[PDB]
Amino acid sequence: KNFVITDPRLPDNPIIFASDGFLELTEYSREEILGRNARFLQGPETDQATVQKIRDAIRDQRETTVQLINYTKSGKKFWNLLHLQPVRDQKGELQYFYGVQLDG
Amino acid sequence: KNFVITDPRLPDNPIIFASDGFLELTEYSREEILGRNARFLQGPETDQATVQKIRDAIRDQRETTVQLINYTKSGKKFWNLLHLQPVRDQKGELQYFYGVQLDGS
Ligand SMILES: Cc1cc2nc3c(=O)[nH]c(=O)nc-3n(C[C@H](O)[C@H](O)[C@H](O)COP(=O)(O)O)c2cc1C
Numbered sequence: 085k086n087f088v089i090t091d092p093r094l095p096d097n098p099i100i101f102a103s104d105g106f107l108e109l110t111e112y113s114r115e116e117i118l119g120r121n122a123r124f125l126q127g128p129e130t131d132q133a134t135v136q137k138i139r140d141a142i143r144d145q146r147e148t149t150v151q152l153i154n155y156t157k158s159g160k161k162f163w164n165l166l167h168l169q170p171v172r173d174q175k176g177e178l179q180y181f182y183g184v185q186l187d188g
Numbered sequence: 189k190n191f192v193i194t195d196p197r198l199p200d201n202p203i204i205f206a207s208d209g210f211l212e213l214t215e216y217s218r219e220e221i222l223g224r225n226a227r228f229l230q231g232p233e234t235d236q237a238t239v240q241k242i243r244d245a246i247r248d249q250r251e252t253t254v255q256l257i258n259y260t261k262s263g264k265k266f267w268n269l270l271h272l273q274p275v276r277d278q279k280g281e282l283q284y285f286y287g288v289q290l291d292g293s
């Protein structure tokens with residue numbers, strides 16, 4: 085399926101893992117996206133209000149589900165039904181976020 | 189939904205990441221399973237022939253999809269539709285495996 089993992093402890097919360105499904109969805113290769121913040125999928129018609137909700141969820145370190153317009157590598161639009169989830173270590177400190185993406 | 193990631197560069201290919209869905213499916217906690225090979229989900233009625241296929245796929249470092257009986261922590265049986273996928277680094281060396289579990293109901 086389609087999922088990624090980011091490290092919020094790294095500069096700009098970059099993707100450190102992406103499934104093959106994510107690669108197929110976005111048309112990007114693994115080498116092209118590792119180490120980058122997932123926001124590169126956003127564009128002109130992406131709703132900023134929804135991005136803010138994502139930003140608030142990340143700050144508050146809570147799970148969230150939103151729906152927003154993303155763009156493929158070739159410039160094709162798709163609605164991304166995005167589910168985010170924080171992962172904590174054994175000491176209860178924030179360690180990762182994981183996201184599950186769905187093409188509408 | 190349900191997925192894990194293992195590290196084949198570590199002894200016994202242990203789980204190093206698990207989604208909340210995986211935790212809910214198997215009734216195990218995150219601390220309980222990190223650092224362990226995923227084989228603990230197998231039990232009495234698990235078909236060894238299927239286990240052998242998985243082992244072959246991991247050896248060959250290719251993706252595979254099987255269905256097999258697994259067990260929750262409490263011992264409840266469930267059909268696991270399991271998909272495995274190898275992941276390589278930029279130099280082409282095997283770096284991870286990821287697995288996706290679907291409950292067959
Ligand atoms: C694990 C994870 C996966 C994400 N996946 C996407 C995505 O697929 N598409 C998208 O537009 N934003 C995604 N985001 C959100 C962006 O990375 C970023 O956090 C969001 O645009 C708000 O941050 P910003 O205001 O600094 O851009 C994801 C975030 C996380 C933590």
Ligand SMILES: Cc1cc2nc3c(=O)[nH]c(=O)nc-3n(C[C@H](O)[C@H](O)[C@H](O)COP(=O)(O)O)c2cc1C
Binds near residue numbers: 193225246
């Ligand atoms: C990423 C990954 C996920 C796996 N998930 C499961 C699983 O959910 N259930 C299961 O019975 N085996 C699963 N396995 C297979 C076992 O970890 C192990 O490879 C299999 O039992 C064969 O090894 P063995 O014959 O030495 O026990 C998974 C393997 C990998 C690499």
